[PDB]
Symmetry: C6
Subunit: 211 residues, 6 copies
């Protein structure tokens, strides 16, 4: 029920999965608890609407169930353009994609931990080699440059309430016409922030559903 | 009831027809269904008005027939200017025309499919050779450069509701004074995204009528 | 009841008259009908007010009489400045005058026809030699460059309603102090869009009255 | 009841007087009537307030007296700055003064007449030699350059009503500390638009009082 | 009740005092009256509040009293920044300070007089040597350049009412850490608009209290 | 209950502590009283809301306790970016951090005293060498350049009421991935405005709690 080999989907999942494995430390009496930051893919307005819905105190079980919601990260595509350096598709087209990575947090410390886990890997760019194999052929080698373009710090108060920092990223990637899922599912690998060659998980696995 | 040989009409139809034959795959229980994206030519404000009129659930048969409406594409001219590099018409005038191609979709996946079918052919430009023959004379050969200028991503929510992406295109074309339909209908051919020589269909054939 | 030899008047009429003789083809049951596009000289705000007064369906004999109103063209001066390349007047002062030519239309087709009759003659400029003779002396030869600067496309809806495209033109002309109508009326000729030497008609002849 | 030798006052009067002597022809049956355009010096907002006060139909004795009010010209200073090319005053300081000259008119024809009498003398500048004599000493020779910087066209409707064009002028003049009226009144002459050496009239003669 | 040796205070007082001694001539029947223009140091908003408070007619004794309030001058610091050309304080730090000098007046004539007394001494700059002696040591010589940056003309009406012109000045001065008033009071002299060496009056002497 | 070795935290504390020790002189009859200006770390809006909560005169016990609140300083991070001049962390990444230092005060004199204690040490930059030791290893030497970028002056009145000046600072520092507190606590020293090597106090000591 979705175009599996979509190039946009692959870039969405790649970006999401780079930021999928981020935890914050939270000290308890019995001991330190490390919690994973759940990440979604959605238009920002959408996400924020639904976030205002979850954070709403409707009953007594909600009062507690409120601090499990934050911290979180929302991801979205916000712009793209041709990337000015016989047919077209591997050899493919140099495209350039703009992503907003929106971190939301109830505690400045939460934010500090998270961003400290992101920010140092972009100087200002972070390279990743991606391998996309078609059926059983030799995989393709796509050089992917991800550039940290800017950051934006903001709040939204009520008495605490909610800290929001947004990073903007430029992916220098590759576009080509759709290759039907029926012609075979694309196998994809990439190098993470430590040059560790992870293989790209399916979409359904990286993003929690806002729905 | 229209000036058939209109230069503007030909550019509207040319653009509309390049993007006329775009389908999205939609996986069903019985098997995959492929649906064509219907295309219109209209002022954007107009299109959106009539679209809000259609999207309104008036009766029970409308509730279903709503997701037959989307996806669609609306096309319009939004600007033109002289294209700065004895009488005038073949030799004609280098003109430059600005088109807004507006894709509306209920599902991110629909969008991904469509744009992946448009975007790779503009690097940033796409050439097409056009042949316009007058009655039975030797056809004229007009070199047409179409350049992808920018993209713009947006929403418009209600609880799903509607994704809207707009591509802006610069057509580098040719203008000349009207040649009366009474002097004979122009025969028009062109090269598509695959250098395949289709001949330009009548207006009534490419655009579904917003009316 | 007006300064006949007014320099501004002469430019208003010249511009008005270049665009005075434009017809659109309108296919009927009995056969093709050609209708002339009527031109007025007025402040834009004004013109649109009176146009909203005329187009308002107050009654039934109006219901029909509404589609005789459109299409039309309103012309106006909007800016002027010294034209940086013993006393003053022939030898006169190089002035530069800015005109807004506003085309209004109920049908996209009407617009296409009209503008296709304007646009090809400005690449980006259109020359005209003007001859202004004083009484019976040797006429003066003023070289007039008219440059097409920009275009602007708009609507104004209600259920159709009205298409509005405005061209902006830079006339590079000549200014001098007023020469009394009592010293004799100035004779003026010019070369039209086909370099055919028409002579400049009186104001009352070119523009229908907005009043 | 005012500092007669005021430098600001002198420039205000020079400017007003260059534009003091302007008439429009107004054709009647009995014969042509020439009317002088009255000029005032006032903040623009002020002038327009009082002008809305005069033009209001309070009675029938007012109804006639309305078309004697327009046309008029309001003049005002709107900016000044040092003019970047032992003590201070002749030798004096190069200053630069900015004037808004505002023409108001009930008929486009009136405007054409007035502005046609102003505009051709600024190409883009108009020089005037000014002679300022102290008591009986040798007059000082101040070269004054007046530059037409821009023009601005506007209306203000009610059913006719009122045309407003504003010229902006850069006077390149001279400033020095105040020379008391008790030390003797300055004698001032200048060259008009025709190099005719008029001598600068007292303020009260050039400007009608808005008060 | 204040840090007497404050560097900011010294610059505020220096500026205030250059403009402390400005009078306007006011011709009366009995004879000419010269009135000194009172100067305050305050935030512009503040000053205007209190000015509206003074100018308000609450009783009959106010009616007369009210027309003595204008003319006046309000002064304030509005910006500062480092002034780009072993420890720090004589040798001290080149700072640059921005002052708004705001002249308010009921009569154009009053304004003309005042500004004619300010404006000519800035071409565009006015130099002044300042001497700050510590206890009994050799005085320090600080070169102070004051530059006239821009001017701004405005009104505020009611039936007269009030003229407001503002000069903006860049003082190129010197900052250093605070030298306690207990370590001895700094003695300060400077050169006025005529290179005449006045010594800096205490704050309380230059500015009338807005409080 | 916070990531002690957080880099953002260290820079917040470094900045806060350079400005931790600022006093103003306040003359009493019994003798001069020196009061330390308290510093907080908070988003500006937050600080201002809570400041409006403290400044509200609710009772008589509140009326006195008003002038103990001011003066104060609020500090916050407002922007950051890569600082464009085998793995990453000491060797670490050149980052650039933007801080808004907001000084609030009831008296101009208070402001003058404070800012005079800050401003002279930034010409436009101030260097500090920081030593960060991990457990017991050899310290790291991070060169920290703090640049004064701009200042901004404002009020907020009610009859006095409150002066607000804001300095903006560019810290040219260093980022690296989080080093767990469990791996040992970081020891930090730095050179203050006088090259005095103080050691960085814990967060809890520098900032008063806004909560």
């Amino acid at each position: 029920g979705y175009f599996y080999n979509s190039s946009f989907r692959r870039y969405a999942t790649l970006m999401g999965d780079l930021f999928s494995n981020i935890q914050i430390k939270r000290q308890l009496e019995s001991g330190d608890k490390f919690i994973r930051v759940p990440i979604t893919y959605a238009s920002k307005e959408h996400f924020m609407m639904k976030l205002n819905k979850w954070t709403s105190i409707n009953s007594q079980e909600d009062v507690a169930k409120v601090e499990t919601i934050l911290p979180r990260i929302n991801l979205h595509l916000v712009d793209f353009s041709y990337n000015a350096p016989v047919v077209s598709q591997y050899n493919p087209s140099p495209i350039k994609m703009i992503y907003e990575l929106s971190i939301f947090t109830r505690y400045e410390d939460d934010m500090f931990q998270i961003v400290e886990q992101i920010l140092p890997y972009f100087q200002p760019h972070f390279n990743t080699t991606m391998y996309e194999q078609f059926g059983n052929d030799i995989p393709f080698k796509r050089d992917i440059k991800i550039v940290l373009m800017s950051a934006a710090i903001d709040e939204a108060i009520d008495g605490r309430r909610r800290i929001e920092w947004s990073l903007t990223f430029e992916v220098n990637g590759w576009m080509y016409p759709p290759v039907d899922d029926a012609e075979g599912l694309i196998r994809t690998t990439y190098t993470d922030f430590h040059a560790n060659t992870r293989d790209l998980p399916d979409g359904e696995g990286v993003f929690e559903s806002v729905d």
